[PDB]
Amino acid sequence: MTMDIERLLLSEDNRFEFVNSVAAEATEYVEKNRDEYGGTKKAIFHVLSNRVNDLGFDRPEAYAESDPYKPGPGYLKEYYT
Amino acid sequence: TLQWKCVESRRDSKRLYYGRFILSPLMKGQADTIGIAMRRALLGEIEGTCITRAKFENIPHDYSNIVGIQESVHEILMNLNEIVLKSNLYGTRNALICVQGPGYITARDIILPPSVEIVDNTQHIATLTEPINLCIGLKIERNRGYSLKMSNNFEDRSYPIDAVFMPVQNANHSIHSYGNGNEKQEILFIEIWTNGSLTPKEALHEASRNLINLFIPFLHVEEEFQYIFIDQLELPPRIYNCLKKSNIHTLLDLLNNSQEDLIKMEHFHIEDVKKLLDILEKK
Amino acid sequence: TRTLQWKCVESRRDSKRLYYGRFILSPLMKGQADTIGIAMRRALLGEIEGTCITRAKFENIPHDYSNIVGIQESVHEILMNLNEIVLKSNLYGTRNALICVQGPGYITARDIILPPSVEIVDNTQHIATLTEPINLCIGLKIERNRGYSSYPIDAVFMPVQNANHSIHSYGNGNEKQEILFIEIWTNGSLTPKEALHEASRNLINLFIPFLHVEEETFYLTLPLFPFHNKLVNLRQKKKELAFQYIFIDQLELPPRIYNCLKKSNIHTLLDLLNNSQEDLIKMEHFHIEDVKKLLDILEKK
Amino acid sequence: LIGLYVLTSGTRRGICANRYNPCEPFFCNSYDAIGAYRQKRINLDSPLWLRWQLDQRVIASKEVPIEVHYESFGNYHE
Amino acid sequence: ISHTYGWPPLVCCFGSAQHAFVPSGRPANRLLDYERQERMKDAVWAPEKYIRAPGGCAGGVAIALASLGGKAAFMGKLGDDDFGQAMLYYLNVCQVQTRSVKIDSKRVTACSTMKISKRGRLKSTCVKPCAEDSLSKSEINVDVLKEAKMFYFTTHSLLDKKMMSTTLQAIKISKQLGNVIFYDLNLPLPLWQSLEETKSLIQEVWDLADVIEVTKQELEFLCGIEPTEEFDTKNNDSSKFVHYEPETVEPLWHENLKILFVTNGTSKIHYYTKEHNGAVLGMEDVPITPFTRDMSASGDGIVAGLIRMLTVQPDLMNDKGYLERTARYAIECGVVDQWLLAQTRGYPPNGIRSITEREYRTSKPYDEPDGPYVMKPVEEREYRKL
Amino acid sequence: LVRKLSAQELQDLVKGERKVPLIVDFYATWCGPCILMAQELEMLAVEYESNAMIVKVDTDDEYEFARDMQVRGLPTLFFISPDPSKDAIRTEGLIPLQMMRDIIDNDM
Amino acid sequence: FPLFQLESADPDFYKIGYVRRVRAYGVEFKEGPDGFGIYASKDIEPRRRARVIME
Numbered sequence A: 001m002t003m004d005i006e007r008l009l010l011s012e013d014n015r016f017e018f019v020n021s022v023a024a025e026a027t028e029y030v031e032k033n034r035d036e037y038g039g040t041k042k043a044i045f046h047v048l049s050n051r052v053n054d055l056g057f058d059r060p061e062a063y064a065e066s067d068p069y070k071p072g073p074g075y076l077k078e079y080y081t
Numbered sequence B: 001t002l003q004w005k006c007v008e009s010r011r012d013s014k015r016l017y018y019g020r021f022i023l024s025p026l027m028k029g030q031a032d033t034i035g036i037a038m039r040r041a042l043l044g045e046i047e048g049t050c051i052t053r054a055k056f057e058n059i060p061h062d063y064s065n066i067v068g069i070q071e072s073v074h075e076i077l078m079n080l081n082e083i084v085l086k087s088n089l090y091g092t093r094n095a096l097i098c099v100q101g102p103g104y105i106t107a108r109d110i111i112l113p114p115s116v117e118i119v120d121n122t123q124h125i126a127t128l129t130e131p132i133n134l135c136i137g138l139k140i141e142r143n144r145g146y147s148l149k150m151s152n153n154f155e156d157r158s159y160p161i162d163a164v165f166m167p168v169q170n171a172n173h174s175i176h177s178y179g180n181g182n183e184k185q186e187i188l189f190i191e192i193w194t195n196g197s198l199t200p201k202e203a204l205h206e207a208s209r210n211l212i213n214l215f216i217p218f219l220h221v222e223e224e225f226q227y228i229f230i231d232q233l234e235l236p237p238r239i240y241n242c243l244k245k246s247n248i249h250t251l252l253d254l255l256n257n258s259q260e261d262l263i264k265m266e267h268f269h270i271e272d273v274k275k276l277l278d279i280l281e282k283k
Numbered sequence C: 001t002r003t004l005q006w007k008c009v010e011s012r013r014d015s016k017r018l019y020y021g022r023f024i025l026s027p028l029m030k031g032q033a034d035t036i037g038i039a040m041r042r043a044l045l046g047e048i049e050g051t052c053i054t055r056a057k058f059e060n061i062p063h064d065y066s067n068i069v070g071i072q073e074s075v076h077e078i079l080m081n082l083n084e085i086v087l088k089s090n091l092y093g094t095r096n097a098l099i100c101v102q103g104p105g106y107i108t109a110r111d112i113i114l115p116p117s118v119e120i121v122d123n124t125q126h127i128a129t130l131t132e133p134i135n136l137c138i139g140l141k142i143e144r145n146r147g148y149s150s151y152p153i154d155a156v157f158m159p160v161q162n163a164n165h166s167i168h169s170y171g172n173g174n175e176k177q178e179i180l181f182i183e184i185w186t187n188g189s190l191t192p193k194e195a196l197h198e199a200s201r202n203l204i205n206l207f208i209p210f211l212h213v214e215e216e217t218f219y220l221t222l223p224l225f226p227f228h229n230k231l232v233n234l235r236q237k238k239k240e241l242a243f244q245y246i247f248i249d250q251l252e253l254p255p256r257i258y259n260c261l262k263k264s265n266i267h268t269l270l271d272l273l274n275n276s277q278e279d280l281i282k283m284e285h286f287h288i289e290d291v292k293k294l295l296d297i298l299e300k301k
Numbered sequence D: 001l002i003g004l005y006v007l008t009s010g011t012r013r014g015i016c017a018n019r020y021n022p023c024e025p026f027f028c029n030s031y032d033a034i035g036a037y038r039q040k041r042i043n044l045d046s047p048l049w050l051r052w053q054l055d056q057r058v059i060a061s062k063e064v065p066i067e068v069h070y071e072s073f074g075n076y077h078e
Numbered sequence E: 001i002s003h004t005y006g007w008p009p010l011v012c013c014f015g016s017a018q019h020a021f022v023p024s025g026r027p028a029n030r031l032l033d034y035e036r037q038e039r040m041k042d043a044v045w046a047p048e049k050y051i052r053a054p055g056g057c058a059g060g061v062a063i064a065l066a067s068l069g070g071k072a073a074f075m076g077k078l079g080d081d082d083f084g085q086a087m088l089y090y091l092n093v094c095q096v097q098t099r100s101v102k103i104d105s106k107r108v109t110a111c112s113t114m115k116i117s118k119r120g121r122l123k124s125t126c127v128k129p130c131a132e133d134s135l136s137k138s139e140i141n142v143d144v145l146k147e148a149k150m151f152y153f154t155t156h157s158l159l160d161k162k163m164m165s166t167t168l169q170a171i172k173i174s175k176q177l178g179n180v181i182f183y184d185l186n187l188p189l190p191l192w193q194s195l196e197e198t199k200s201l202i203q204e205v206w207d208l209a210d211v212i213e214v215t216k217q218e219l220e221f222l223c224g225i226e227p228t229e230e231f232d233t234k235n236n237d238s239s240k241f242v243h244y245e246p247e248t249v250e251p252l253w254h255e256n257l258k259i260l261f262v263t264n265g266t267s268k269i270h271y272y273t274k275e276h277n278g279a280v281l282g283m284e285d286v287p288i289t290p291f292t293r294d295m296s297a298s299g300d301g302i303v304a305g306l307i308r309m310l311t312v313q314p315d316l317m318n319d320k321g322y323l324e325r326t327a328r329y330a331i332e333c334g335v336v337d338q339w340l341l342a343q344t345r346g347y348p349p350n351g352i353r354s355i356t357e358r359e360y361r362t363s364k365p366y367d368e369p370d371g372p373y374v375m376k377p378v379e380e381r382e383y384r385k386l
Numbered sequence F: 001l002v003r004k005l006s007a008q009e010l011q012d013l014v015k016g017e018r019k020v021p022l023i024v025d026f027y028a029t030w031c032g033p034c035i036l037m038a039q040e041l042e043m044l045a046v047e048y049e050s051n052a053m054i055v056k057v058d059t060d061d062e063y064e065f066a067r068d069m070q071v072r073g074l075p076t077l078f079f080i081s082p083d084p085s086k087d088a089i090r091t092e093g094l095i096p097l098q099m100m101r102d103i104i105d106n107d108m
Numbered sequence G: 001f002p003l004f005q006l007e008s009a010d011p012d013f014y015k016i017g018y019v020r021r022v023r024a025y026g027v028e029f030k031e032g033p034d035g036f037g038i039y040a041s042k043d044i045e046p047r048r049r050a051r052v053i054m055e
């Protein structure tokens, strides 16, 4: 997603305009479908993935990924600092 | 229950295999120990097959190049060092290369001992342009990675090949930890890269078996006076002075020396040995 | 008799709760001693379990930071003394013991009423001293565990105090053999030889799972029976067996084609059906005549 | 920074490498050298020769060869 | 198609694919540490009498050999019923080549019809044999016999007349195609009486075998030696593990015999050749369970390891060092197989309940109020004076 | 409930008459598959409360009788039909319960 | 089941570009008797915005 963010800014004359447009698109996403965002799907990540996908580059939707190795419900990964 | 599974596998080429394996559930601290032991076993306890020595026939004049061969002798040895082999051979065998003339000499042009196979037959060895017969006598061994160089054959002007017996190119382990309150659980991941002479699953099994064989033998069974000084003792001056010359000051040290060492020190005789025992018996 | 031998080259009992032992293992091939030493050290320091007191219950105590009249030690000192008791047991579970004495006198580790599965290592370990004839009943909780943790007691379950190992060149470089020495310090709950054997067994049990069958290999003690139950269920409501459970062995094939498929990691009918003609053409000894005859054989099925 | 400095500090050279005036393994690829290092065959700073199959891209002093070994068959070593 | 024969060489295991079937079991002695056994007797299960089975069926040896990374094919017959199909599937998922397995729709797997004579004493007089006893000479797969470089069989195939004829035909065909014949005795239960009839039954196949593996008890039985040592005594005296001289095994030798392996479990393996003889010590203090007490997995693993080592280097069958290495490898394979079986089956507590070793070594809390390990009400205390 | 019966007791039961199928378990105390078969037969006897009879004969104590019955190994079960006309079934190995049920319900 | 069921340009033409940061997405170079041309190697699905074809 960092690489995608850098790629999207290679076609933007002004980065502040890019941020404003992304925020406006995310706001539209949230207003149209409120219940689909806030959990595993984030609106800004969805906007970024769609803008990357609009170029023809395949990306997972909203960069939403989980851990297939979670040992059932209730178990939380303990991060190793 | 404690189970294992292969979660990823690939074959990028014929001499590059990859695999990822899982082991769960584990208790705290077990995954690190298992990963460390498995990585050591994978990197050095697995046996590999390599060409360890080459003999050049047809009188190459022992020069840096042979007429008609594009590659030099050192280049030929470097090419031979890259050939990936697998076998079950015990001891040392011999292989032969004898190509008629012009064309490309590859791994396919090696006559092998009975147990030896070739992972990739497209590996280049030498290029021949002129119709000249090239005869090379290869020595093939099978050893562990942590092994060493055997007895050198100083004779018959045979060029050694510094073979590195590493069928497993690389290995890594990682730990994922989970928990909900007082009960914890961790997962072991093992990555294995092999040169095609072995699959990552075969490497995992061989490493486990080698570790177990390394820890079986430990279960084998078999068939069925400091404060009593010399001066306070009434000793003759001759015996007393000899003890100081040999740095003996306390009766504890006097009893620490067997009668063999007492006679060894200078100016000490058998009579003095008997005299010492009598006085000690009287005190 | 054995070419590779091990022996205890020194055994020493410094005190009732400090045993020492040094062991040898030779001759080892170069590199084996390092692996054995590191794995054995980690098993001794982390994988050996011990039995400890983990919970003691009093009756007339406001909090563990108070005193008892006639007992020289406060509750905190009594708990600290209880934490230092070395026990031995081969079994798991939360056993309970009892301290029930009347003073005056010294309460040593031999005053604990243990269940038959738990034993005392050092009878002379001190708990408390009673100066006058008072009642004192303490209920204890005992379990066997690894690592470390009614008033809770911070129990350290590790019975090996320290470990060390050294590697020495055997001699002339025939195979550059090596000599391994292992030093073990225990608290008396088990001897250094017992610690060595238990560490070896624990390491074997840690490395043995990779030699089982891979997860999701048999259909789900006796793996044969669940598949038999599946076959019995399939016998009613006849729907035959899935292609994944049918192997190319039971398909009448020429031996050359069978070997070619086997060397390409083709085992079941589902894999054969999911294969493509071009990929099979990419395999040697598999001509278009072989392709058409294999297709005819599959069509016959 | 210290780790990188130690990693990229090369061989001991000259009088710090040999006691007397002199009157090394060859690896096909870098993976072989790293594998030999893992198997304790070589040290972190012991010299070795690495076969290079790319363009000349090694930063070094712009100097002519120390010695050229020209063979009568045509091959020469710089 | 000799150019399609890969590595390792294929091994043909001729016999029956039984499920947990034990031929026999004899009293045995194993190397053990008895201080540990005395100390660990409340957590480690041991049999009151140590009796060791020689091994199992040919299908078990085929499965064990495949687990070692070797190439194994099973030649036998199974019925088309649910049990036979389950056994065939189990052999298939164990990487055992089952193309030489004949499926008979007219036979029942593991079931035989017996005509009991109810006039005198009870005899059974088998009428219709089971599926894995009806392999005809025409059903022998000759392609696998051409590909295979070693032929394996057991004495269980010699009990039926037709199956014995089929076994003889297969052995002769394999010998014609230049294979090494491995005879694993594994003496069945009825053959332990009347040594002379056992010799009469096995004499023909004994002379056609290049490698023969027998237990110490089987070697004593065939040589007419009575067991002079003691059983179930807490020591490891050398009289329990005796390396018989080649003169003792001299009567059993023949012209084409290369190696004779005498196994005492994983404790000790003795090898005999014409020029060399010796023994290798092992280890038999493996986890044992009431479900795994017969130690058949150890025998299967030992035989599989011997076959693997002999097939990978067939030109070193007379090399003494390679024979020592082979014996050690077989010991290790048997130990690993026994450990795995102990872990798989578990301890007793399809109706089959098992508990793990962790549950077996778990004791009761001893929290009975009547017990002396609980704080009783102050009415009944029973203090002890210091 | 499986009851340990000697050779002569089994002779008496066979030469007698019964209205229920008789299952004879040939076992030894040194075989683990014999214990697994014992668990299976215990469940089976729970399944057939009174319509079948399951007995166990120790092979080590009755080796001559086991040899007379052509018992080639362990575990071995003998299914004796109540009708004298039909033949007995000898099952070798640790067969599942469904096989026993099928035998009793089809050829008994 | 899978078992039951204009020329391409010189690869070096795109390779010399590719090694110098030339990227063609979803299109392949094909050569015919008329001359060189660029053709979609697959189905270029329509997106909200313009899609990058070459760089």
Ligand SMILES: Nc1ncnc2c1ncn2[C@@H]1O[C@H](CSCC[C@H](N)C(=O)O)[C@@H](O)[C@H]1O
Pocket (backbone or CB within 6 Å): G034, G035, G036, G037
């Ligand atoms: N639509 C069209 N029909 C026929 N010729 C065309 C065309 N578009 C372009 N061309 C030709 O292509 C040239 C542009 S360069 C385009 C590629 C060129 N055909 C080649 O193979 O190298 C022009 O000279 C023109 O003659």
